[PDB]
């Protein structure tokens, strides 16, 4: 079955370069074109041109003549787009799509990859333990604060995954331009604290790893 | 939006018919157009392609549910007992040439909910500040808010008894000496009408 598989999220400042790649699978790579859809905070999506997978040839829609660059691995069955002297208004989320039969232009799409263009520092999080100090026969609620990092995303496991069930971890929240986050777990009693218990996150754009045993008090 | 137009937000009752209009310039008046449906967190999705005469092709996943339909410059996508899984954003899409050149042109696109959805009220979760935050001289109080649908809800934060399925959370962040300094603090959480509160004590 059909997927395009694209790059993860980018953050650059302006002037600099950035390349994103599209990975295709499940059709026959140099068959169909490749185009480029680039969707900006607060419009809509905006068509940038596509390059013909077989011939190598690129076409670029006017606002995209000069920076813009489409280039193909092939071998690997994966398109490229590098975008050179960053501006602030190149901030967008960037799509791949391939076109179909009979003259569909895009029939299917990659999930997008996030290209933030900025000066704002990557900053990695502080990480809290959330216990109670340690009645009988009650159900007992722990938690991971992941406070005051940047750019996005963070993610968060207990005891490296094995602990899953009841973990519910939240949607991030963007407050004056950091981001926090926050997981719990409910663990009967009594499992804790006789059993350990250990958040584990991770902030990839700082190359962060932190782990917290959480422990009775507070 | 003067080829393509598209009203960009539109709700429905569960269960029942929903119709989209996307609209065509006078220049543009019978040409076909694609629809494409954008959810958060996956790839955008190819629904249908929609000629003049009202015909049409679909899929892709796309369920039986969708159909679509013209009226002179109007073109219609319509979704029969529509259901909660079908909230999205709907864009209309359509192709030219333009002196020689290929362009194309997407609308600004329609965001669809679906009202009158069963509700599941919130479970409240709430944590103090860590002795850790607390040493550093800081205090984030949190509320974690799970269990519930359909998705929505509105948090308020109150100190001493006045102000100032899917998940959500709420932060208030607050200095050491903030937190000491009240008798309680509560996470008040609105759903669907309906409010729910839980509250921390510095006392305990």
């Known amino acids: 079955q059909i997927q395009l598989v694209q790059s993860g999220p980018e953050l650059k400042k302006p002037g600099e370069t950035v390349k994103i790649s599209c990975k295709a699978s499940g059709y026959t790579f140099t068959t169909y074109g490749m185009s480029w859809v680039k969707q900006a905070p607060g419009k809509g999506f905006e068509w940038m041109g596509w390059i013909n997978t077989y011939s190598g040839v690129p076409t670029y829609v006017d606002d995209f003549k000069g920076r813009f660059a489409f280039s193909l691995e092939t071998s690997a069955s994966t398109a490229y787009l590098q975008i050179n002297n960053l501006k602030n208004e190149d901030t967008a989320v960037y799509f791949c799509?391939?076109?179909?039969?009979?003259?569909?232009?895009?029939?299917?799409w990659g999930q997008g990859t996030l290209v933030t263009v900025s000066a704002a520092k990557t900053t990695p999080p502080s990480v809290y333990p959330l216990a109670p100090g340690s009645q009988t026969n009650s159900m007992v609620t722990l938690g991971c604060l992941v406070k005051g990092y940047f750019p996005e995303p963070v993610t968060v496991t207990w005891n490296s995954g094995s602990l899953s069930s009841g973990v519910h971890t939240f949607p991030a929240v963007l407050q004056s331009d950091l981001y926090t986050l926050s997981s719990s777990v409910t663990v009967p009693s009594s499992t804790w604290p006789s059993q350990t218990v250990t958040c584990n996150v991770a902030h990839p754009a700082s190359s962060t790893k932190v782990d917290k045993k959480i422990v009775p008090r507070d | 939006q003067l080829v393509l137009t598209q009203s960009s937000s539109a709700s429905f009752s569960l269960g029942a018919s929903a119709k989209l209009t996307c609209t065509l310039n006078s220049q543009h008046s019978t040409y076909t157009i694609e629809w494409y449906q954008q959810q958060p967190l996956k790839p955008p999705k190819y629904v249908m392609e929609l000629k003049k005469d009202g015909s049409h092709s679909t899929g892709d996943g796309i369920p039986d549910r969708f159909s679509g339909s013209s009226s002179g410059a109007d073109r219609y996508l319509s979704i029969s007992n529509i259901q909660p899984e079908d909230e999205a954003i709907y864009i209309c899409g359509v192709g030219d040439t333009i002196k020689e050149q290929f362009v194309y042109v997407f609308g600004g696109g329609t965001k669809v909910t679906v009202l009158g959805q069963p509700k599941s009220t919130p479970t409240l979760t709430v944590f103090p500040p860590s002795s850790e935050e607390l040493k550093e001289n800081k205090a984030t109080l949190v509320c974690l808010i799970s269990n519930f649908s359909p998705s929505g809800v509105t948090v308020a934060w109150k100190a001493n008894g006045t102000p100032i399925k899917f998940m959500a959370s709420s932060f208030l962040h607050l200095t050491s000496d903030q937190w000491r300094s009240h008798n309680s603090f509560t996470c008040q959480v609105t759903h669907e009408g309906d409010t729910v509160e839980k509250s921390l004590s510095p006392a305990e």
């Open positions: 799509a391939r076109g179909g039969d009979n003259y569909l232009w895009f029939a299917y």
